[PDB]
Design an enzyme around this catalytic site. Structure first.
Site, short mmCIF file in Angstrom:
data_model
loop_
_atom_site.label_atom_id
_atom_site.label_comp_id
_atom_site.label_asym_id
_atom_site.label_seq_id
_atom_site.Cartn_x
_atom_site.Cartn_y
_atom_site.Cartn_z
N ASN C 206 1.20 -2.16 12.84
CA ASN C 206 2.66 -1.85 13.07
C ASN C 206 2.90 -1.73 14.52
O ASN C 206 4.07 -2.52 14.96
CB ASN C 206 3.10 -0.55 12.33
N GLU C 254 -13.55 -22.72 4.51
CA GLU C 254 -14.21 -22.84 5.84
C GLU C 254 -13.50 -21.66 6.92
O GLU C 254 -14.37 -21.45 7.75
CB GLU C 254 -13.23 -24.18 6.25
N1 LIG Z 1 4.89 -4.36 8.01
C1 LIG Z 1 5.21 -3.27 7.35
N2 LIG Z 1 4.70 -2.23 7.12
C2 LIG Z 1 5.22 -1.24 6.02
C3 LIG Z 1 6.36 -1.90 5.29
N3 LIG Z 1 6.57 -0.60 4.58
C4 LIG Z 1 5.72 0.21 4.79
N4 LIG Z 1 4.76 -0.12 5.66
C5 LIG Z 1 3.53 0.40 6.10
O1 LIG Z 1 2.67 0.91 4.90
C6 LIG Z 1 2.65 2.07 5.06
C7 LIG Z 1 2.69 2.84 3.71
O2 LIG Z 1 3.22 1.82 2.80
P1 LIG Z 1 2.79 1.68 1.29
O3 LIG Z 1 1.37 1.49 1.02
O4 LIG Z 1 3.59 0.25 0.52
O5 LIG Z 1 3.48 2.74 0.43
P2 LIG Z 1 3.49 2.95 -0.90
O6 LIG Z 1 2.35 1.95 -1.51
O7 LIG Z 1 4.69 2.86 -1.72
O8 LIG Z 1 2.84 4.64 -1.29
P3 LIG Z 1 3.87 5.77 -1.53
O9 LIG Z 1 4.26 6.38 -0.28
O10 LIG Z 1 3.07 6.71 -2.28
O11 LIG Z 1 4.90 5.32 -2.47
C8 LIG Z 1 3.36 3.01 5.92
O12 LIG Z 1 2.65 4.04 6.76
C9 LIG Z 1 3.96 1.94 6.83
O13 LIG Z 1 3.32 1.95 8.06
C10 LIG Z 1 6.96 -2.88 5.63
O14 LIG Z 1 8.03 -3.18 5.18
N5 LIG Z 1 6.49 -3.72 6.73
#
Ligand SMILES: Nc1nc2c(ncn2[C@@H]2O[C@H](COP(=O)(O)OP(=O)(O)OP(=O)(O)O)[C@@H](O)[C@H]2O)c(=O)[nH]1
Ligand SMILES: Nc1nc2c(ncn2[C@@H]2O[C@H](COP(=O)(O)OP(=O)(O)OP(=O)(O)O)[C@@H](O)[C@H]2O)c(=O)[nH]1
Ligand SMILES: Nc1nc2c(ncn2[C@@H]2O[C@H](COP(=O)(O)OP(=O)(O)O)[C@@H](O)[C@H]2O)c(=O)[nH]1
Lengths: 72, 219, 440, 428, 49, 46, 433
Positions: C206, C254
């Site tokens: 990110n 590939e």
């Molecule tokens: N690029 C991008 N990264 C995201 C976004 N939303 C969350 N993240 C990253 O993903 C991490 C956690 O996201 P998730 O694994 O989807 O969270 P979750 O699966 O809903 O887990 P919970 O918090 O327990 O609900 C965060 O630390 C963010 O850095 C997004 O919309 N775009």
């Protein structure tokens, strides 16, 4: 003989012997470490760890050793 | 001087330049073999006995059952070396282990081709001599060894083809070195005769495929 | 004829998939109702929808997507918003209890009420398949759903579809900012268990997209919409060669064959060229040499690890637009003459080239219409620093058993942390071993 | 068949060659697109002297065009007879000569000379019996002064038994378009001394005097200047290209005009040249042509021949014309002016008479003179060189480019060595 | 027929939209297609130009 | 190798710098500076 | 292929630049939106991207905002690719020790990167054209910085510098004297042809020829623009005796150090007056050696023309020029040096001078004489005195030795300009032997 006794007088043989830095540059010299392209300007000398440097502007990605190094 | 097929080649009296030299009939750079490494560690059951009757490789364990599978193809790579306290070891190890055999050398034939071609790859005359004695002893050693090496004539023969016509033109003067059988043209001739003889029912097609000029024996 | 199945796990995966399917619907040419324009053409018209869409024989493009989450208000957004009619209602799959940033509540306890039904929908989507190219999962190494349920999904998919390709699009945690405290724990565990089921895992951090947006796209306040849009452009540039026709068409198999030297080493760094910003777009040539150099620039890479601090192993260029192969060849030669680009000595031909004639499509948003682009997927040894960073973070937290009971008291054993940490240490030594030069 | 490879070096040589090819394509009947629309069979009899045949009756001129700057050669293409040249021997480079003999002889000139020599060999043996090479160049400046002499040296090395003519524009003292003309001129004369077989020196002010007074032109342009050079080039190689008797080729002119090997610097002159107002006042005859040829103001080199002795004189007449008054005029000028011709060469005027006149003309004449008036030109260049080199002025660029201090002195040594036979033979 | 500039004559002219109307014969690569109809977008573009 | 006759501290100092060039225009420059100056003309005396 | 990249440093640069780019555009034709209404005569100053976007080839740079933000929000807003215009936050406050040391090591990196991107698109950069203003930090300090780094990088190229040297009397700052003596190295060791201009003289040219009694800066920078165009005219348009940047240097810079030429345009007349004059080649050539139509306050009747290069443009036929140059050699008030006999490199392009909605009348014939006179020592000296008058009381020195520059600098700087004066002063004297 008049050509030699005239060429080695002083006030023009000094002007002919001396050469500026740019004149020294354009005398078929050979500088190996330089920047042939912007892909060398960004990369070969940057002093910016992409892993360690966090949240820097465009002017902070490239900081040269010659930029932070003393003059001449 | 003119380099190639340019307009300078057709310049009246034009001295054309020759091509670069070729790696054939030229020595190759040697490499450290696994013979040296395994010997320096010292898992070999060997010792030069230093006899006055000629150098002999004394064996601590019985030769008839050692392994012939992690040893004999490993002693085959010692045929890429010229230094004395490994070259004799390779020579009289390989010859003695091919002498004492029977129903145990035959499954090793596919695993001993790469050291043979690597021995032939470097163009030293003495080591080509020694490995030609190795191939002759190997084909005369046991049964069906030539019949298992007949699908393998097509990669140990091409360097055996380069030096076929290298007999000495001594004239009426006699060659006083027939003892140390070194004349590699004659050694290739004898090796191909032994190959065709103890090769099987169909070997001349592969042999003539690799070495172009050959007049058949046993006709 | 050459289909892929997209599975979006967790909130990050679902939002990335929202951006991805928005890009696909405006790229192939499909209105948000799921149907086709009747008084407008398309973009040319072909079977170039089949990989990401399925006809129901009535003009309805239903996509091959499974948006799974253990928590609502993320799937409720896509059932309420403008793409509520594109997705089949049984495809969008929702639990009723959050994973609570726990790998345990995604892999061990709350994964079992949903894994059977997710695999049933996956089986239906794989039944409607002529030839399956593979699966594309979209997740993060952060949250509990995106770690644990992705883990359980890979465990089941490796059994059910063992001869099939599976590509991860994983949001790697940032080395400095992060979002949660248990991100090192979740990341070590999920890469431990997906390290033998992921055929290839593109990690995208990110912080580096934040840096790209502030330094090239000129956005002083970017958000997850911009980040997911740029990741969606990456994913389109990856799997566009099996959608349109190009000079050197390159497939997912590939990608795997030319990008992975050894079977555990499957972590390419992805970067994109034209990340330019409309009012800065029409003044440059955006030539093929420029877009090739901008990928090897150590500021457009999307994982915070310096490619100079390592050795390149195998890089795959994917060009889109008015790209002639001679310009690719000249740019590759110019890159290879550069000394600071270090390729490993056991890979002379370090480049894998793909060229497509389809120019990139722009969503109304940040990026600009460019007639040339390239996605560069570099498998290199620079990722050892990024692994060792959160490895040290794992050590710092695990030395006092902080936050470990929230995993232990829910079926998960204590020794799984040590197993995962050691497999990271083994991954570190594998990276060093594959990296250093040959002397024998 | 005998045939000449025409080389143009520099902007001056390129424009001079372009005007020459325009004039001789008009003379032979070759249109801009290469085909032939003529009136007599005598024009295509010896078309294989300057024109290589191609498919479909396309006659491509045997010319190699060289410059370090691709800006005047683009004008050569965009000119009238521009789409007649081959684009492959059109050899160019993307650099600047810098008006530097050093940069034209030991830098990018030496990197482009191999590309020149490849195509030069190619039309040197798209051949059956080659006679020679014809380099048109400016003696003062870059490219033509530097790469011209480099090409001269390499061509004399490759083909040592073939005639080499060089039409050289030598710098003028009235004005100058370059401040390092003494350097370039001296260094190029040093190479011209022991190499070429026939040098033709053409000062600019002599053409200016012919344009202002003889032709009475009001706005003389560089094309008007180049037209006289084109006319004398066509006049010299005329008995080699058209029928007649007393056929003098380049080798016969070299034999009858070069008594000693270093004395081959000629001063040409074309003399059916009259004004528009005085055009209809003429009584055009062989006496009138002899009169205008030996009047010392139609000379195309700024060297008054009354300040010295003629060694040899060549007269190449063109037209249907009787031989008695030709021999009478050549004998009469020598009898009249006995203090302007040397006495150790009896009958030091040659005669060649071609039959076919240049188009628009019925009777023309080309004058070539190996007079002792060239010593004024050479010593004048030497005085300017000694005024500039005594201070080492403008020398840092040559020396940093790769010249040596000794080489300028050695070039000056052979330059004023050249002035010594042409004064010992001026004063016996 | 793949997406490329379709030749019209022997000398290598591509078909433009200035000679593409409804109800016409167009020849390409030997064949002769009979264009019949078009949509509202093509209609408004052609009447606009 | 090395020698005794290299442990010797040399007495070489920098030769004194030559004086600056006074210029042949300095008198003209000073005269031009003094030219056009009339004290106490617009502001006047206190 | 004949591309040249401009680098406008300082308000002087940024402003002189806007003036030059209205002409370059009005010349080739590139309108103020990049598009060229209805052929390679533009590659030098304009880089064309697919779809007539004729983007420029320059890097306007100022350490403060404002100046550049007028171009970013002005009529030519959709021409200069945003990045090219590089700006900072704080000015150097007329302190070379700010541009070359503190507030200056923050923009040097980005500017050198933009310069590379431009010098990576060119197939043959013939030279860099700089435009500073010895007087401020973004005109003395940042220039020194940029030049010291440019030389090292782009080495075997060119660096034709154009400067607004302090005047012999007026001036606008009390710290100008210091900065100029300090920027001597950038003009002596890190340059190729330093054309130095002075506001006072261009203002005299205006209050005498153009009849403008209240000249502004705009009027002045337009005159600098037509001078630059004439110099870069034989690379874009076509002519007979065309001459490049490399050629000017040969037939000018006599010895490596002697490279401080002076410039003077020819027909600087105004619509009305230009109805009473014939503006022939002689009128223009003579009125170029005139000891007034010069652009630096220096009477050439005090020095020896070491090498004057004359670049014409328009209804000039080689014949007239040759005749005129000769007249000049008759007049004995214009004495030349005795070591440069042929002292004239004539160059003739065709495009007649282009006219911008403003003043200088539209003419069919113009000339620009880049001459290397020995009468430039007077400027060097005027400044020498002002610096020596203040450095004695070490006035306004704290600011510099507080931003880095150690006193040692001022002293070295002094010695340099001193040697420079020796070189010139003693190079027109007659042969002692
Ligand atoms: N690029 C991008 N990264 C995201 C976004 N939303 C969350 N993240 C990253 O993903 C991490 C956690 O996201 P998730 O694994 O989807 O969270 P979750 O699966 O809903 O887990 P919970 O918090 O327990 O609900 C965060 O630390 C963010 O850095 C997004 O919309 N775009
Ligand atoms: N043609 C022209 N000349 C100018 C202009 N502005 C200033 N000058 C000249 O430049 C001199 C000093 O200005 P600069 O050196 O440019 O000041 P600066 O570079 O902005 O330095 P800082 O004030 O520290 O930011 C003045 O003496 C003027 O003669 C301008 O706008 N146009
Ligand atoms: N006769 C004739 N002379 C020319 C022509 N063009 C240029 N010259 C002369 O050639 C001289 C120098 O040319 P130069 O700079 O050396 O051209 P370069 O060889 O390309 O460098 C000038 O002084 C001109 O007088 C032309 O077209 N005809």
């Amino acid at each position: 003989n008049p050509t030699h006794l005239a060429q080695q007088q002083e006030p023009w043989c000094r002007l002919s012997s001396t050469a500026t830095i740019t004149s020294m540059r354009r005398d078929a010299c050979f500088f190996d470490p330089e920047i042939p392209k912007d892909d060398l300007d960004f990369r070969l000398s940057a002093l910016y760890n992409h892993h360690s440097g966090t949240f820097k502007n465009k002017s902070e990605i490239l900081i040269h050793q010659e930029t932070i190094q003393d003059t001449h | 001087v003119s380099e190639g097929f340019t307009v300078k080649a057709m310049m009246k009296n034009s001295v054309v330049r020759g091509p670069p030299t070729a790696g054939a009939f030229k020595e190759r750079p040697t490499k450290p073999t696994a013979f040296r490494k395994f010997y320096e560690r010292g898992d070999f059951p060997i010792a030069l006995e230093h006899d006055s009757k000629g150098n002999k490789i004394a064996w601590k364990v019985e030769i008839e059952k050692l392994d012939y599978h992690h040893y004999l193809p490993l002693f085959f790579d010692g045929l890429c070396e010229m230094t004395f306290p490994y070259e004799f070891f390779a020579r009289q190890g390989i010859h003695d282990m091919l002498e004492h055999g029977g129903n145990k050398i035959l499954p090793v034939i596919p695993q001993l081709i790469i050291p043979i071609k690597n021995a032939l790859n470097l163009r030293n005359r003495q080591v080509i001599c020694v490995t030609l004695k190795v191939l002759q002893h190997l084909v005369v050693s046991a049964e069906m060894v030539g019949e298992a090496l007949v699908p393998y004539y097509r990669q140990i023969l091409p360097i055996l083809n380069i030096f076929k016509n290298m007999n000495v033109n001594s004239g009426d003067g006699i060659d006083y070195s027939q003892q140390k059988r070194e004349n590699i043209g004659d050694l290739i001739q004898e090796t191909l005769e032994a190959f065709e003889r103890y090769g099987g029912e169909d070997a001349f097609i592969n042999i003539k495929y690799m070495v172009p000029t050959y007049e058949s024996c046993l006709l | 004829q050459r289909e892929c199945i997209s599975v979006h796990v967790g909130q990050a995966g679902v939002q990335i998939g929202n951006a991805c399917w928005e890009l696909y619907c405006l790229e192939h040419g499909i209105q948000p109702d799921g149907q086709m324009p009747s008084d407008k053409t398309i973009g040319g018209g072909d079977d170039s929808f089949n990989t990401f869409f399925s006809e129901t024989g009535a003009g309805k493009h239903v996509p091959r997507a499974v948006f799974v989450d253990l928590e609502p208000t993320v799937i409720d957004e896509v059932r309420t918003g403008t793409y509520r009619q594109l997705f089949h209602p049984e495809q969008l799959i929702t639990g009723k209890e959050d994973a609570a940033n726990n790998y345990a509540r995604g892999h061990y306890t709350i994964g079992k009420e949903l894994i059977d039904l997710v695999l049933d929908r996956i089986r239906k989507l794989a039944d409607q398949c002529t030839g399956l190219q593979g699966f594309l999962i979209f997740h993060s190494f952060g949250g509990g759903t995106g770690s644990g349920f992705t883990s359980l999904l890979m465990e089941r998919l490796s059994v059910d579809y063992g001869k099939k390709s599976k590509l991860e699009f994983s949001i790697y945690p940032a080395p400095q900012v992060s979002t949660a405290v248990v991100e090192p724990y979740n990341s070590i565990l999920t890469t431990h268990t997906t390290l033998e089921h992921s055929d290839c895992a593109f990690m995208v951090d990110n912080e580096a997209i934040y840096d790209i947006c502030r330094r090239n796209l000129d956005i002083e306040r970017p958000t997850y919409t911009n980040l997911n849009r740029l990741i969606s452009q990456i994913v389109s540039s990856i799997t566009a060669s099996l959608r349109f026709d190009g000079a050197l068409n390159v497939d997912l198999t590939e990608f795997q064959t030319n990008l992975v030297p050894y079977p555990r080493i499957h972590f390419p760094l992805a970067t994109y060229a034209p990340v330019i910003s409309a009012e800065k777009a029409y003044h440059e040539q955006l030539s093929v040499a420029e877009i090739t150099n901008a990928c090897f620039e150590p500021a457009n890479q999307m994982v915070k690890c310096d490619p100079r601090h390592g050795k390149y192993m195998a890089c795959c260029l994917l060009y889109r637009g008015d790209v002639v192969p001679k310009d690719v060849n000249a740019a590759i030669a110019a890159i290879k003459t550069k000394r600071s680009i270090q390729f490993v000595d056991w890979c002379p031909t370090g480049f894998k080239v793909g060229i497509n004639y389809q120019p990139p499509t722009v969503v109304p948003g940040d990026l600009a219409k460019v007639q040339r682009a390239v996605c560069m997927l570099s498998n290199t040894t620079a990722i050892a620093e990024a692994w060792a960073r959160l490895d040290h973070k794992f050590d710092l937290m695990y030395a006092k058993r902080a936050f470990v009971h929230w995993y232990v008291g829910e079926g998960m054993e204590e020794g799984e942390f040590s197993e995962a940490r050691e497999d990271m240490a083994a991954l570190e030594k594998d990276y060093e071993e594959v990296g250093m030069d040959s002397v024998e | 068949m005998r045939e000449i490879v025409h080389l143009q070096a520099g902007q001056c040589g390129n424009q001079i060659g372009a005007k020459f090819w325009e004039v001789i394509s008009d003379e032979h009947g070759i249109d801009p697109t290469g085909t032939y629309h003529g009136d007599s069979d005598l024009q295509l009899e010896r078309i294989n002297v300057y024109y290589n045949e191609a498919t479909g009756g396309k006659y491509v001129p045997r010319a190699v065009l060289v410059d370090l700057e691709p800006g005047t050669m683009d004008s050569v293409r965009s000119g009238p007879f521009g789409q007649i040249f081959r684009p492959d021997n059109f050899v160019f480079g993307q650099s600047g000569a810098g008006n530097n003999w050093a940069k034209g002889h030991y830098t990018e000139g030496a990197e482009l000379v191999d590309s020149v020599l490849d195509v030069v060999r190619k039309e040197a043996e798209s051949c059956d019996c080659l006679q020679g090479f014809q380099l048109t160049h400016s003696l003062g400046g870059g490219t033509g002064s530097g790469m011209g002499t480099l090409l001269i040296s390499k061509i004399r090395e490759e083909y040592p038994d073939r005639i080499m003519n060089t039409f050289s524009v030598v710098p003028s003292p009235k004005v100058s378009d370059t401040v390092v003309e003494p350097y370039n001129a001296t260094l190029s004369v040093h190479q011209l001394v022991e190499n070429t077989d026939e040098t033709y020196c053409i000062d600019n002010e002599a053409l200016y005097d012919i344009c202002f007074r003889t032709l009475k032109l009001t706005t003389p342009t560089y094309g008007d200047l180049n037209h006289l050079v084109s006319a004398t080039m066509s006049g010299v190689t005329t008995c080699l290209r058209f029928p007649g008797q007393l056929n003098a080729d380049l080798r016969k002119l070299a034999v009858n005009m070069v008594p000693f090997p270093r004395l081959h610097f000629f001063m040409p002159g074309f003399a059916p040249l009259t004004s528009r107002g005085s055009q209809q006042y003429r009584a055009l005859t062989v006496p009138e042509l002899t009169q205008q040829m030996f009047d010392a103001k139609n000379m195309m080199a700024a060297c008054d021949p009354r300040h010295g002795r003629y060694l040899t004189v060549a007269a190449v007449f063109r037209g249907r014309m009787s031989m008695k008054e030709v021999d009478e005029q050549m004998l009469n000028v020598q009898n009249k002016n006995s203090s302007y011709f040397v006495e150790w060469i009896p009958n030091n005027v040659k005669t060649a008479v071609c039959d076919i006149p240049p188009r628009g003309l019925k009777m023309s004449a080309t004058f070539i003179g190996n007079s002792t008036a060239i010593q004024e030109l050479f010593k004048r260049i030497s005085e300017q060189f000694t005024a500039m080199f005594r201070r080492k002025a403008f020398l840092h660029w040559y020396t940093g480019e790769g010249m040596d201090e000794m080489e300028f002195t050695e070039a000056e040594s052979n330059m004023n060595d050249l002035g010594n036979p042409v004064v010992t033979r001026g004063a016996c | 027929i793949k997406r490329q500039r379709l030749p019209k004559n022997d000398r290598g002219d591509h078909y433009h939209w200035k000679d593409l109307n409804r109800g016409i014969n167009i020849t390409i690569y030997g064949r002769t297609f009979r264009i019949v109809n078009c949509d509202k977008f093509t209609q408004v573009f052609l009447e606009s130009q | 190798s090395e020698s005794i006759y290299n442990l010797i501290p040399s007495d070489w100092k920098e030769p004194p710098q030559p004086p600056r060039y006074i210029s042949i225009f300095k008198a003209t420059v000073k005269d031009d500076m003094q030219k056009f100056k009339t004290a106490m003309k617009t502001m006047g005396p206190a």
